[PDB]
Amino acid sequence: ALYEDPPDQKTSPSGKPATLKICSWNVDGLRAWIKKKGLDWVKEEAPDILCLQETACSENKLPAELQELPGLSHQYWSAPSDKEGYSGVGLLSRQCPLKVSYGIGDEEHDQEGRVIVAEFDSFVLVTAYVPNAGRGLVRLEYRQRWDEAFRKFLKGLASRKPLVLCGDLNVAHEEIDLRNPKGNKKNAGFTPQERQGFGELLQAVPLADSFRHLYPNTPYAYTFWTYMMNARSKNVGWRLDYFLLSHSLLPALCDSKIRSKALGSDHCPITLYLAL
Amino acid sequence: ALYEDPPDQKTSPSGKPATLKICSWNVDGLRAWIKKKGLDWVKEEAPDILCLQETACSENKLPAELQELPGLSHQYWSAPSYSGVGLLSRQCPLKVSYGIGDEGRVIVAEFDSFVLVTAYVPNAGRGLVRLEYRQRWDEAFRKFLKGLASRKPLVLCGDLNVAHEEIDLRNPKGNKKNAGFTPQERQGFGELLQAVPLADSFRHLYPNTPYAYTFWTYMMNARSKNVGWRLDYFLLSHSLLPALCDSKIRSKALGSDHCPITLYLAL
DNA sequence: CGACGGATCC
DNA sequence: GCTGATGCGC
DNA sequence: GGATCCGTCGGGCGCATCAGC
Ligand SMILES: [Cl-]
Ligand SMILES: [Mg+2]
């Protein structure tokens, strides 16, 4: 069953007009993504803030195209120190953030290049590339430990400002969040353990799934599809990328989009509209 | 005999423009230096990389203004378990390590084209009580740096706690048995240059310039009298000399008993 | 990880 | 410098 | 005996490293 994201809704049902557009995209290799025209799609989307995951590209290797982005001139990049072809995240902002930080506690020694924190006037933005549990779940226990360290990190932000967490959280929360729930409950992304850790994230911090909060019963809405077996053509996918919002930000929430048609990766973009 | 640092030359000998600005500063107490508006000066200088020595501030007590520099958003710190160093970077380093392989004195940041080492070299101490420690530290340091420089071009910056030659301090005759001008320490610095090998960026460009210092004792108004020492260096692999645009001494920036130093590289 | 083969359920 | 093989994780 | 369940298997992608020339 294919899926068509509904039109963009740009006013917080309190009538206010959207003033902030954030796009998040796991690009599956930033240099590949750019050669497949990913940046052309970003220019059309014209977000205020762009968060990317799986850049897999040291900052010295960033294509020049990325420097002719005058609407996204404040750029922050993070790659792991042991694995230059894996992981890596980036945050690009029209306006300069008040503060930027990396990691979830000890990045100066555990240089993982998975998390960026950017503080703006009225909110704190986190973007994350959550560690994959691996084929055959070989890294599932590390993922569970990482999840708990992340929850405690987010909780323990010393800000009174509401939180926006976005990116590839690497779990389809509920059964509606992927096309084959049953044949996947022992696969990375849909174990009981990862689903539980997403559940605890929402409760402990606390946070709301912006998309599901708006479209609580809509099925077949995914953000990832394996390259194999033409899954994307058949919309056999998983919803792995999210905008999760502090409770206070919900009256500001105008919409949470899935940009199903944007190619260039095995994930598609997601976009948030906030009225601030 | 006062000193006016020449203006910044931001063009390489072969005409290529500076692409990399590195600033090193012994802040003599990180919290005090921030209170004395050190971060305001850094925001104006706007380096790509900032190296700090003598931070004397455990990680959990690092002031909050520091995260208010998104232009130096990658921040690395090494505490001694009087010491401590930091390395703040605009771009994400490829790799960052700590120490010299054997006190919170050294951070190593690996970049695309080069490796950056910042060092707070141990002072031989009043009464030379720690000269022997310093001598062992010097040798362990040279040996560690040769390994690094064998894999990539080397930039070494920071407070090396020695005035190499007589021109490098105001009172050479009265200090030939004091920390920072002993025969041993000067020998160690020459061994450092010859063994690795490295070039003294500032002395390479201004070989005949006297009265150029980066440290002055707080006492007896020495900074007002420019009674001081050139203790803070940028040393470079010979391979990088074609990229050298300038090596500056920021005599006027206050907040410490050392002043900042700034390197321009055309990479 | 979706497709596939094989077993099990009423 | 360049290509394609292999390794590894996604 | 159609629907469902469960375990196994082959593999599309990007990037690093290595060999060969
Ligand atoms: Cl960065
Ligand atoms: Mg991926």
Q: Report whether B91 contacts A60 (CB < 8 A).
A: yes
Resolution value in angstroms = 2.1
Residue B166 marked as a ligand binder: no
CB within 7 A of strand E (chain A, 125-184): 182-183
In the sheet that holds A208-209, the strands lie side by side as: A99-102, A115-119, A124-129, A163-168, A241-245, A208-209
Is B95 touching A (CB cutoff 8 A)? Answer: yes
Tell me the two tokens of residue B110. 């690996």
Tell me the two tokens of residue A271. 């976009």
Tokens 């959550």, located at residue: A130
Q: Report whether B248 contacts B209 (CB < 8 A).
A: no
Q: What is the span of the domain harbouring residue B133?
A: 1-267
> Which of A172, A165, A137 lies closest to A151, judged by CA?
A165
Q: Which of A59, A98, A100 sits opposite B91 (nearest CB)?
A: A59
Is B70 touching A (CB cutoff 8 A)? Answer: yes
CA angle A159, A161, A163 (to 5 degrees): 100
Tell me the two tokens of residue B133. 């420690």
Range B114-131 burial, b when 16+ CB lie within 10 A, else e: bbbbbbbbbbbeeeeeeb
Tell me the two tokens of residue A88. 């890596």
For strand C, is any atom closer than 7 Å to the CB of A234?
A: yes
Experimental approach taken: X-ray
> Which of A147, A98, A106, A101 lies closest to A126, judged by CA?
A101
> Most distant CA pair in chain B: distance in Å?
48
Q: Report whether A247 contacts A208 (CB < 8 A).
A: yes
Is A83 touching B (CB cutoff 8 A)? Answer: no
Q: CA-CA distance, B50 to B36, in Å (whole number)?
A: 17
What is the spatial distance, in angstroms and rounded to an integer, between the CA atom of A23 and the C1' atom of C1?
27
Residue B5 marked as a ligand binder: no
Local structure of residue B224 (DSSP, 8 states): T
Return the H-helix or E-strand segment holding B32.
Answer: helix B30-35
Neighbours of B145 (CB within 10 A): 24
Bridge partners, residue A242, by sequence: A167
Q: Report whether B253 contacts B259 (CB < 8 A).
A: yes
Concerning whether A129 is annotated as a catalytic residue, the answer is yes
Overall residue count recorded for chain A in this entry: 276
Tell me the two tokens of residue A80. 């792991």
Tell me the two tokens of residue A134. 């691996």
| Structural domains of chain B, count | 1
Catalytic residue of the set A129, A222, A242, A273: A129
In the sheet that holds B20-26, the strands lie side by side as: B74-78, B85-89, B49-53, B20-26, B261-265, B244-249
Q: Helix, strand, or coil here: A126?
A: strand
Return the H-helix or E-strand segment holding A154.
Answer: helix A140-155
Q: Which residues contact B221 (CB under 8 A, 6 or more apart)?
A: none
What is the spatial distance, in angstroms and rounded to an integer, between the CA atom of A10 and the C1' atom of C3?
41
Assign residue A67 the CATH number of its domain.
Answer: 3.60.10.10
Neighbours of B212 (CB within 10 A): 18
Long-range contacts of B10-15 (CB under 8 A, 24+ apart): B10/B245, B10/B246, B10/B264, B11/B245, B11/B266, B12/B242, B12/B243, B12/B244, B12/B245, B12/B266, B13/B242, B13/B244, B14/B242
Catalytic residue of the set B5, B28, B76, B120: B120
Q: Report whether B202 contacts B234 (CB < 8 A).
A: yes
